[PDB]
């Protein structure tokens, strides 16, 4: 007899704009407005060590604005043709909305409008549709995911010591992370992260080392080896009153594609030694023997599938092996990885593929195969906390959203705290059990 | 005959919670919910080099949580006594809401509930009431301020090189900043900042200096003197293709309190040389003749009032002299400063005094005496962008909200971008003429 406003979920307006990300580079933000007055707003993140098979960002390449990194053309895609194609459509139909943008762009890698333009609209849409349905984003996402009412709070892998490309040290491994698997709630996990992070600063200050931070809020001190990184962390964990290996485990992102040349892995700060696939795998195995490293990400080059089959054979029963640049959140690639015994986990980055619908498809493929899914940030982030709702709504079980500093990271932890406060034990923090091989 | 929901502006619930700030320390967030369904949310920032006379930030001191920096007591204050005193009150009456909290705390420095508790609610209340009136925060702020429909976009001062206490170098001056006075819009100002910040990273790398960032997203490289901080900024400005003095002026925060002992200013990075108050003023003066430094903040110790009078005589006709620790956003102190010819500008930090109403009284006192007001962040921030709305809605003319990295900073620039998009020339960017002494 009376039609409520929630039923008026047709798109009446889409606005795009150029804003600034956490590294000072432009990004695209979109607003999606519905007939009933609901609005969602979202922005695209941006990677610094991008896989070669990622969907493509659209930048302007004008050297007189933002050193060629403007996104005014992606913004005009949002305001002109994306807007045109979606006005009149039901935001609640996420898949239909995404399919429209994908077909209109027409390219394999979203190179006409940019995966940045398309993703920002895909996420803003989902938020507008959640508002129209009278629910928080995490709840809407679970329904779009095919898993209505099923939540978990994820176990975070928190970056605290950095190496590799553009880190003034002899550390080759791009990220060393702590995971507070002994916490009972995500709120306690976050407190634990914070305590270790502040104790690490004290440790590094006592060694004379630098405590300024990188892109992800963690430290990049002048260390002498990949091993010294694991030791300062061990020292910080103990000063915080926690036990390495039962309260807190360790995870790594090697970003090994960055040090792979002419078929060998070159460890620039490890006497500059060169390694085969098989040898770099054994170098990693030994590290997991000396330290409670339970997860290793991109331990070989994104094209070294023979090498990944062997790493999975050696380490996979015991260690989570996370493909990032390996799978680029792409179902066509993940599929083949699964069929070939390649890795046992996937890092989920929605701007690697460019839409929410295809991101949920990757999570689903992974879970169907017994692979774990770790929801992730990019180096370039914004104040947007969408990956927190996403992690909870897909019950992914793990998240990777930075150190315990910079609001580009901390906003996601804050949102995890608001969501857990609301769900309580309807969103269990499962701890060590989430991690492939425990 | 029918009442809108907007008229149901009575408070029905206030929730407080403990979240995390951009340094990894706890802070207070509050939600104010009104009968008509309107909700506002805000969080208190936190200083790192606080004035002696700031209102009190209440922390817990429990070593078992966050190294003693929990805010559960301030949170309990929000949830219990503050909520009980505000339920049933009209959120549109900001002065009346704040008065209730102030009278109920009962202390001069808000040391019973914490200025962090009271501020979070004061801001949250204002946001909820903005929504209840059907308007953006900046517009509501202008109406609260007694200046309805009067707006400007602030000229930002952007902190790109760091020294002082939280900086691992021999630069004594806490902050070196650029101001893009030559810009025509804030959007362009922001673009200029980003470009200069990226060119600075290249300049610093070519000198083999570290390009990681401190709390405010600026660089803290190992420079030999205070003057060398100015010189590398001028390389970066030129390498970005801008003209120092015309497109971009310079500003500084001395935080000179931090290096005052036994009545002298000791510059650890001009080889421990001790300066009388007047010689330090001469030191500053000499920098302003070498570089187009147009603003100097906290150039003497907060209690060195005779020094400040002197500094005002020497510098105040040509240079903006900003009291931060000197005035602590406190009308009692600022009044006395106005009376004594002390400074000509005030840094406005709402958590130094504890309420929006008292903040607006500080801005008004400044402007009534011809002093400029610069709305400011603290080192410890969140994803909250309230100071952008506050700057525009009071037409303050200036903002200090950090470097062009970290979303604890960039969120504020982004919100300035959204506001300028909505207002256009209803919110002029006035450029250099905002700065006291031009
Ligand atoms: O490889 C990476 C970088 P990127 O910016 O996403 O490339 C940061 C992220 O933690 N991760 O897994
Ligand atoms: O003195 C200060 C520090 P604080 O954290 O607020 O003390 C950072 C800010 O720019 N300002 O003016
Ligand atoms: Mg990468
Ligand atoms: Mg990675
Ligand atoms: Mg200070
Ligand atoms: Mg200051």
HEC string of A234-265 equals HHHHHHCCCCECCCEEEEEECCHHHHEECCEE
State how far the Cα of A416 lies from the Cα of A433, in Å rounded to an integer: 19
Q: Is A174 annotated as a binding residue?
A: yes
Write the DSSP symbol of residue B154: P
Give the integer Cα–Cα distance in Å for A228 and A226: 6
CB atoms within 10 A of CB B246: 11
For the record, the structure tokens of A396 come out as 């992914």
- Residue B343 CA to residue B49 CA, distance in Å, equals 20
Q: Where are the alpha helices (DSSP H) in A71-114?
A: 72-77, 83-86, 94-105
Instruction: List chain B residues with CB under 8 Å of A26.
Output: 194
Token reading at A197: 């992070």
User: Tokens 């040290």, residue?
Assistant: A169
Compute the nearest-CA separation of A370 from chain B (Å).
34
Q: How far apart are the first and last CA of chain B?
A: 56
Beta strand residue intervals within B35-84, DSSP E:
39-43
Q: Is B216 marked active-site?
A: yes
Q: Do A17 and B67 touch (CB under 8 A)?
A: no
Binding-site residues from annotation of B: 174, 253, 297, 324, 349, 378-379, 400
**In 10 A of CB B105, how many CB atoms?**
23
Count, in order, helices (H) and strands (E) of chain B. 14, 15
- Nearest Cβ partner for A405 among B24, B403, B418: B24
Which segments of A106-224 does DSSP mark as H helices, in order?
115-133, 137-145, 186-206
Q: Could you tell me the CA-to-CA distances from A40 to A34, B189, B364 in Å, in that order?
A: 9, 27, 36
Question: Where exactly does CATH 3.20.20.120 map onto chain A?
Answer: 135-438
Say whether A216 is catalytic: yes
| Residue of B65, B194, B383 with shortest CB distance to A24 | B194
- For residue A302, give the 3-state DSSP assignment: coil
Residue B25's CB is within 10 A of a number of other CB atoms, namely 20
Q: Using alpha carbons, select from A345, A285, A336 the residue that is nearest to residue A310.
A: A285
Element containing residue A71 per DSSP (H, E): none
Three-state secondary-structure class, residue B44: coil
CA distance A377 to A387: 7
> Where would I find the H helices in A22-114?
72-77, 83-86, 94-105
CA nearest to A269, candidates A277, A258, A278, A279: A258
* Burial track B53-80 (b if 16+ CB lie within 10 A, e otherwise): bbbbbbbbeeeebbbebbbbbbbebbbe
Which parts of A199-267 are beta strand (E)?
249-253, 260-261, 264-266
Residue appearing with tokens 């933000």: A29
Nearest-angstrom CA–CA distance, A257 and A263: 11
How distant, in Å, are the alpha carbons of A84, A98, A112, A292, A351 from that of A120? Answer: 16, 11, 15, 38, 9
This structure's resolution (angstroms)?
Answer: 2.2
The encoded tokens of residue B358 equal 């008292």
- Which residues are near ligand 5, the ion (C-beta closer than 5 Å)? B 49
Cβ B77 vs Cβ B16: under 8 Å: yes
Q: What is the dihedral of CA A33, A34, A39, A41, to 10 degrees?
A: -50
CA atoms within 13 A on the CB side of B240: 27
Contact B75, B43 (CB under 8 A): no
B411, A191: Cβ pair inside 8 Å? no
Q: Where in chain B is the domain with CATH 3.30.390.10?
A: 10-134
> Which residue has tokens 């933002």?
A66
Residues ≥6 apart with Cβ < 8 Å to B10:
B34, B35, B88, B89, B90, B91
Asked whether residue A400 is marked as a ligand-binding residue, the answer is yes
Cα(B72)–Cα(A161) distance, integer angstroms = 30
- Burial grade of A103 (CB within 10 A; 0-12, 13-18, 19 or more): exposed
Task: Give the H or E element holding residue B322.
Answer: strand B320-323
Task: Give the CATH H-level superfamily of domain B10-134.
Answer: Enolase-like, N-terminal domain (3.30.390.10)
A412 is known to lie in a ligand binding site: no
Contact residues, chain B, for A212 at CB < 8 Å: 168, 210, 212-214, 219-220
CATH number for region B135-438: 3.20.20.120
Contact A178, A248 (CB under 8 A): yes
List Cα–Cα distances, A124 to A44, A131, A143, in angstroms.
Answer: 10, 11, 16
> Are residues B164 and B267 in contact, defined by beta-carbon separation less than 8 angstroms?
no
Q: How far apart, in whole angstroms, are the C-alpha atoms of residue B157 and residue A356?
A: 38
Question: Which atom of ligand 2 lies nearest, measured to the CA of B349?
Answer: 6
User: Do the beta carbons of residue A409 and residue A402 sit within 8 Å?
Assistant: yes
A382 and B191 in contact by Cβ < 8 A?
no
Sign of the torsion formed by the C-alpha atoms of A280, A286, A288 and A291: negative
Give the helix, strand, coil percentages of chain A, each rounded to 5. Answer: 40, 20, 40
Indicate which atom in ligand 1 lies nearest the CA of residue A253. Answer: 12
Of A29, A213, A407, the CB nearest to B213: A213
Q: State the Cα–Cα distance between residues A56 and A65, nearest whole angstrom.
A: 20
Identify how the structure was determined. Answer: X-ray
Report the C-alpha dihedral over residues B52, B55, B60, B63, rounded to 10 degrees. Answer: -20
Spatial CA neighbour of A215 closest among A174, A256, A169, A180: A174
CA B372/CA B434 separation, integer angstroms: 8
Element (H, E) at B83: helix B83-86
Beta bridge partners of B283: none
Centre of ligand 2 to C-alpha B347, Å, is 10
Strands A11-20 and A26-34: antiparallel
């Amino acid at each position: 007899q009376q039609m409520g406003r929630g039923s008026m979920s047709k798109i009446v307006k889409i606005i795009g704009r150029e804003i600034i990300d956490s590294r000072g580079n432009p990004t695209v933000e979109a607003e999606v407005h519905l007939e009933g007055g609901f609005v969602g707003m979202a922005a695209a993140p941006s990677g610094a060590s991008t896989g070669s098979r990622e969907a493509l960002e659209l930048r302007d390449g004008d050297k007189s604005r933002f050193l060629g990194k403007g996104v005014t053309k992606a913004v005009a895609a949002v305001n002109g043709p994306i807007a045109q194609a979606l006005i009149g459509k039901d935001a609640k139909d996420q898949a239909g909305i995404d399919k429209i943008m994908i077909d209109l762009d027409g390219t394999e890698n979203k190179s006409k409008f940019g995966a940045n333009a398309i993703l920002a609209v895909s996420l803003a849409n989902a938020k507008a549709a959640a508002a129209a349905k009278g629910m928080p984003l995490y709840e809407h996402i679970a329904e779009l995911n095919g898993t209505p009412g099923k939540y978990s709070m994820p176990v975070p892998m928190m970056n605290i010591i950095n190496g590799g490309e553009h880190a003034d040290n002899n550390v080759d491994i791009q990220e060393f992370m702590i995971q507070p698997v002994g916490a009972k709630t995500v709120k306690e996990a976050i407190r634990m992260g914070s305590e270790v992070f502040h104790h690490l600063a004290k440790v590094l200050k006592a060694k004379g080392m630098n405590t300024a931070v990188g892109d992800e809020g963690g430290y990049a001190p002048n260390l002498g080896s990949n091993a010294e990184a694991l030791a300062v962390i061990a020292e910080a964990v103990k000063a915080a009153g926690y036990e390495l290996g039962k309260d807190i485990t360790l995870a790594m992102d090697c970003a090994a594609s960055e040090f792979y040349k002419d078929g060998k892995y070159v460890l620039a700060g490890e006497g500059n030694k060169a390694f085969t696939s098989e040898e770099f795998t054994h170098f990693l195995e030994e590290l997991t023997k000396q330290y409670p490293i339970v997860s290793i990400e991109d331990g070989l080059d994104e094209s070294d599938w023979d090498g990944f089959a062997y790493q999975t054979k050696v380490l996979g029963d015991k260690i989570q092996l996370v493909g990032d640049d390996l799978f680029v959140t792409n179902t066509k690639i993940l599929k083949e990885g699964i069929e070939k015994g390649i890795a046992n986990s996937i890092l989920i980055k929605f701007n690697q593929i460019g839409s929410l619908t295809e991101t949920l498809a990757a999570i689903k493929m992974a879970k169907d195969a017994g692979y774990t899914a770790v929801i992730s940030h990019r180096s370039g982030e914004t104040e947007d906390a969408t990956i927190a709702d996403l992690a909870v709504g897909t019950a992914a079980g793990q998240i990777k959203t930075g150190s315990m500093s910079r609001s580009d990271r901390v906003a996601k932890y804050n949102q995890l705290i608001r969501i857990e406060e609301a769900l309580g034990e309807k969103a269990p923090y499962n701890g060590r059990k989430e991690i492939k091989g425990q």
